[PDB]
Design a protein around this nucleic acid. Structure first.
Ligand SMILES: O=C(NCc1ccc(F)cc1)c1nc(N2CCCCS2(=O)=O)c2cccnc2c1O
Ligand SMILES: O=C(NCc1ccc(F)cc1)c1nc(N2CCCCS2(=O)=O)c2cccnc2c1O
Ligand SMILES: [Mg+2]
Ligand SMILES: [Mg+2]
Ligand SMILES: [Mg+2]
Ligand SMILES: [Mg+2]
Ligand SMILES: [N+]
Ligand SMILES: [N+]
Ligand SMILES: [Zn+2]
Ligand SMILES: [Zn+2]
Lengths: 184, 368, 368, 184
DNA sequence: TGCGAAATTCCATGACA
DNA sequence: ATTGTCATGGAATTTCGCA
DNA sequence: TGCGAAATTCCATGACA
DNA sequence: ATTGTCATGGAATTTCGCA
């Protein structure tokens, strides 16, 4: 059996609805299975159309052999199946109510959700502008299991933005108090 | 002048007036019988005016000026006085072309790593497509990997929007651009400082300096043209296709595609290479590092037989940027302060400013 | 296809499939273990589609297309099939640049006599001066003697007015011009026929062909610029001065001014030459005739190491004149009917017409 | 004494007033002394100004050492003297009431007057357009005394318009009759 | 019958929309 | 059915002045 | 240990406003 | 304070298949 590689499998999922930022409401999350590399795309809906528009960007950089998702409507539509067929991409679905990725991906998706929450508090409406720095953070974060960041695994070099502070990622007492205020 | 010529007539020897010819007086003027015929030897105090009058007829160079003078006059070392005037004629100095080529081009070292140096440039205006008219083109120096963004203007704002999307992936050490409006604005400088990105600029009016990206512009336009043959020029929807197509094209000299140099493995595109199927990613990244360092690098070509190279303190002239109709193509002479490299210099210029300038936009001032 | 590959699997020898490699079946496909690794040998009936798909990714040339294919496949003489497709890809043929230079330039014989051949051209638009914007420039081929006329337009009517004044002096056998609107109108053709003057035209879009006058345009503009330095560009009143100035300037290679070649004696201008003062006019005209025939004539330079020269029946392509944004720079292939000279041909073109065309506006179609 | 040459002496004179042609009324006549070459310039007045404008054209082709004329007002003005001085041209005047040129020039001026008269009859108003052909005729006319036309003497070659018909130059009986009509 | 220096010739370079 | 040209200023080469 | 032919490499040419 | 580049397709050169 051949060793696992970048582009072997992209794991995709939506996060949201979120507070409106520059008119956007969701984040399409794409994580490379082998490297843990993350790409994020702001969308206005979790629709097949927004998924195609977003993945059109990514797949103009690299094409995955397999896209893995849950049975979201956007991902099970025949339009999205057409799209993937056109590009020679195999589609892969977790069974309903039972999402399975890999340890690495699960953990990454977790960090993504937590990191978003942490920075959207105080500025719940400014997340659109922060997506770039979010991704750099995620992709320059040291992986305990492998000796390397996703950046390093994807490009085979060190990065010019090492995030040397492995961070709190937890909400400070002040943030817990004003998170219970904004959600009221 | 009058003293010299006097002592000559009475048969004494003066240095530079050959002894074997006979010098006489006639019509109130010193003459001499020379093989070509009888010429007037004017007094030395008259010679500058003569040379000047000859030169000014049509602002001619060495020989064409000399040939006029020689019709009537002879004196010692005529061409020396002709060249003296040539080097002093402001109008000839700033209007005439050079006849000395630039020294041979430098082939700068390929950036060692991906993201070490980006080269960016605009293409356009192109025919309107979805309201778009330009393309921002970003080329990674080491790999050749290229990103394309459609814009409505070659603006700082559209550049910033595009690079915010790009730098989501990674941040480059250096961004090299030409002096387009978009890249030299203080807004763009801030944007770069904010990210710890060093901005590097081409010398002005010298697109060779952005050669890495310029050369990609060619392929970009060439592929777009082919795809658009016998269709209306709806290029917008093809940018992505073109980007992917080019990033996955082999350079015959390198034997690698830019995608390969960036990732060390093909993604799911047609005719993907499978040679590292049995390597671990780590073995693969190790082979990639080896592949990156051993790439063909070209050398400085031979100089042409009449090139010049800048020397500190030399009088040189900068090419006028957009010369108006019937105006000189060159600025007034200026001095070489520093020789940055054989093809790049700092000059103390026409405004009294330090300018960093390409040799290609310079001529050495003639006649010193 | 299926028959060939079948006979191969059972170990028989087929021409062009080297015997020393082992060919097997796997996943329903013929394969072979080659030094680089295991490649799929497709059936011959599949190969055109493969080559085409590889080529079409980015419309790549020989090597870059081959390198894609070689990633997955091997068959005998792959490049032969790649080149086959290249020569059939309309889009590559009309978009790609040539990589073969024109053969070396001809140096046509100098017209034997003054008035044998005029070269005419327009300069402009220039900054408005007295309501004028252009200059008609007429250069006698043999002598270089030049006449200048200010016009308001590069029109047939203004050309005719000017040449009526000029031909007061003498009528030329031939007038050579480029294909400017003014010279190709039927009015101008009549004007010339009326006078028994033969009109000769440059091949289209090839200013070298009017080189004699073009080169004078340079000197004309260069002198005007010098005279106008630090003044407003009031060029009208300087045309006459420039004309006289240039007609009386020496060509260093010839040692004669154009005035001298036309008249064999200087008129009352500064630094007039006096060498024929003691000759009769008849002795002078005799020396002139001798001087006219013994002038330096340059020769055809060496060909560059990768030039092409036209051969009757060759597929060649004409450069598109003013190609629109993102459109091919070349027309569809056409055939060489006649080779007028090594630098000039007649082609049966894209419209089904005979066109007389410069080699500089042609490339040889690639891949035959 | 040095042999006679082109540009040694230009002989100038006005002819007119004539019937208006394209607004013009006179002809400035210039004849090279040595060659007998003729240049003609249409003017609106026999003024210093029209003479300068016309000679500016000619002297942008060749400059004579000496201009010879009678004591016409146009030619004796201090403006015209200035003009000539500027160009290093010596000015030369015949004594009043006693015009002297040379045989060659006299004869040429004669041909000019006669040839003009011949062609202006029938079309007294179309002479402006005919000046070119007039000059070619004059300059390609065989000189009995020298073996050559002015063209040949000026350029040292044959011409592409030889006027092989040495012509009548005399008015036909029909022309004498309609010359006495137009001048009535 | 040979030297140093001046004069002449050679010619690559660039620009004619 | 038409086709490059030639001013320019350093360098290379030849000629000149003298012995 | 050497041949004919294919494969690979060389590289001048031209175009990026 | 900065610097040309590289796809292209014939030709030159090297390698391959076989003996
Ligand atoms: O792309 C360029 N291609 C030409 C090119 C490319 C590569 C090569 F080797 C040669 C030529 C280009 N050219 C510019 N110029 C416009 C013309 C007047 C002055 S200029 O500087 O020449 C330019 C100006 C401003 C911003 N970007 C520019 C730019 O991109
Ligand atoms: O003067 C010319 N100078 C350029 C030149 C001169 C000499 C040389 F060697 C190289 C270049 C010139 N160029 C014209 N063209 C305009 C550009 C598009 C097609 S083009 O044919 O190139 C042109 C067109 C129509 C009429 N007269 C024209 C003309 O005079
Ligand atoms: Mg989901
Ligand atoms: Mg630019
Ligand atoms: Mg023209
Ligand atoms: Mg009179
Ligand atoms: N470098
Ligand atoms: N010729
Ligand atoms: Zn000058
Ligand atoms: Zn193609």
């Amino acid at each position: 059996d051949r060793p696992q590689k970048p582009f072997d499998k992209f794991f995709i999922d939506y996060i949201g609805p979120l507070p409106p930022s520059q008119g956007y409401l969701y984040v399409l999350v794409v994580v490379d299975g082998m490297t843990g590399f993350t790409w994020l795309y702001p969308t206005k809906a979790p629709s097949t159309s927004a998924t195609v528009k977003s993945l059109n960007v990514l797949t103009s950089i690299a094409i995955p052999k397999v896209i893995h998702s849950d049975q979201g409507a956007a991902f099970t539509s025949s339009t999205f199946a057409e799209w993937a067929k056109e590009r020679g991409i195999h589609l892969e679905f977790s069974t309903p109510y039972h999402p399975q990725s890999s340890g690495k991906v699960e953990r990454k998706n977790s960090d993504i959700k937590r990191l978003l929450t942490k920075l959207l508090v105080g500025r719940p409406t400014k997340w659109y502008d922060l997506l770039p720095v979010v991704q750099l953070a995620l992709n320059n974060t040291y992986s305990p299991v492998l000796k390397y960041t996703p950046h390093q695994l994807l490009f085979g070099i060190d990065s010019n933005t090492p995030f040397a502070n492995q961070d709190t990622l937890d909400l400070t007492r002040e943030e817990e108090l004003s998170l219970l205020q904004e959600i009221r | 002048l009058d003293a010299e010529l006097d002592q000559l007539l009475q048969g004494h020897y003066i240095k530079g007036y050959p002894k074997q010819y006979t010098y006489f007086l006639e019509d109130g003027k010193v003459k001499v019988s020379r093989p070509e015929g009888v010429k007037i030897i004017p007094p030395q105090s008259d010679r500058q005016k003569i040379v000047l009058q000859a030169h000014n007829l049509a602002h001619t160079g060495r020989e064409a000026t000399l040939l006029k003078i020689a019709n009537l006059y002879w004196w010692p070392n005529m061409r020396k006085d002709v060249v003296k005037q040539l080097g002093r004629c402001q109008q000839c100095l700033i209007t005439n072309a050079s006849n000395k080529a630039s020294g041979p081009i430098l082939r700068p070292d390929r950036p060692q790593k991906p993201f070490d140096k980006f080269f960016i440039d605009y293409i356009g205006p192109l025919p309107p497509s979805q309201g778009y008219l330009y393309v921002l083109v970003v080329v990674d120096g080491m790999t050749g990997f290229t990103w394309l963004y459609p814009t409505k203007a070659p603006s700082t704002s559209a550049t910033v929007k595009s690079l915010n999307v790009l730098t989501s992936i990674a941040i480059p050490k250096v961004i090299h651009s030409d002096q387009g409006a978009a890249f030299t604005s203080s807004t763009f400088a801030e944007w770069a400082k904010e990210r710890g990105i060093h901005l590097e600029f081409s010398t002005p009016y010298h697109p060779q300096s952005s050669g890495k990206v310029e050369r990609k512009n060619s392929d970009i336009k060439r592929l777009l043209t082919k795809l658009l043959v016998g269709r209306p020029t709806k290029w917008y929807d093809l940018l992505p296709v073109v980007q992917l197509a080019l990033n996955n094209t082999y350079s015959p000299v390198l034997k690698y595609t830019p995608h390969q140099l960036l990732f060390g493995i093909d993604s799911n595109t047609p005719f993907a290479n499978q040679d590292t199927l049995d390597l671990t990613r780590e073995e693969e990244l190790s082979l990639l590092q080896e592949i990156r360092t051993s790439l063909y690098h070209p050398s400085t070509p031979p100089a042409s037989s009449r090139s010049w190279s800048p020397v500190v303190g030399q009088l040189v002239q900068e090419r006028v940027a957009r010369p108006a109709s019937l105006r000189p193509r060159w600025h007034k002479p200026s001095t070489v302060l520093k020789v940055l490299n054989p093809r790049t210099v700092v000059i103390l210029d026409h405004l009294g400013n330090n300018r960093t300038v390409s040799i290609d936009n310079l001529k050495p001032t003639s006649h010193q």
